[PDB]
């Protein structure tokens, strides 16, 4: 029962939804993607101006 | 003189036999809650296996 308990606690990590991916690594991927999208928007604006 | 210890023992063992059986029914609830929580955890973890396969 203890084995089941900390296995569930380790896999859930405080979220009701399962967390297969590393959560802070996942939001790191998300912020990298968002900042890359902002840089791409600036770059495409510069491409349109050029 | 043979009646009195037999009568006393017949009075005593009648309540002695029903005694100590309360330990079983008070230990039953711990096993019941453990089994029920682990069973709903089992179905939740089967659904977690399915959702993890989807993810």
From Swiss-Prot, chain A:
Compartments in which it is found: Cytoplasm, Cytoskeleton, Microtubule organizing center, Centrosome; Cytoplasm, Cytoskeleton, Spindle
The organism's place on the tree of life at top rank: Eukaryota
Secretion signal, residue range per the UniProt entry: none
Family according to the record: Belongs to the HAUS3 family.
Biological function: Contributes to mitotic spindle assembly, maintenance of centrosome integrity and completion of cytokinesis as part of the HAUS augmin-like complex.
Subunit structure: Component of the HAUS augmin-like complex. The complex interacts with the gamma-tubulin ring complex and this interaction is required for spindle assembly. Interacts with EML3 (phosphorylated at 'Thr-881').
Descriptive protein name: HAUS augmin-like complex subunit 3
Protein's gene: HAUS3
Residues of the full protein shown: 504 to 553 of 603
From Swiss-Prot, chain B:
Localization per record: Cytoplasm; Cytoplasm, Cytoskeleton, Microtubule organizing center, Centrosome; Cytoplasm, Cytoskeleton, Spindle; Cytoplasm, Cytoskeleton, Spindle pole
Coiled-coil region: 12-55
Highest taxon, organism lineage: Eukaryota
Tissue-specificity statement: Widely expressed. Expressed in pancreas, kidney, skeletal muscle, liver and heart. Weakly expressed in lung, brain and placenta.
Summary of subunit composition and partner proteins: Component of the HAUS augmin-like complex. The complex interacts with the gamma-tubulin ring complex and this interaction is required for spindle assembly. Associates with microtubules. The interaction with microtubules is strong during mitosis, while it is weak or absent during interphase. It is unclear whether this interaction is direct or indirect. Interacts with EML3 (phosphorylated at 'Thr-881').
Other remarks on this protein: HAUS1-depleted cells retain functional cell cycle checkpoints, but the depletion decreases the G2/M cell cycle compartment and induces apoptosis. The protein level remains constant through the cell cycle.
Family to which the UniProt record says this protein belongs: Belongs to the HAUS1 family.
Role played: Contributes to mitotic spindle assembly, maintenance of centrosome integrity and completion of cytokinesis as part of the HAUS augmin-like complex.
Name of the protein described by the UniProt record: HAUS augmin-like complex subunit 1
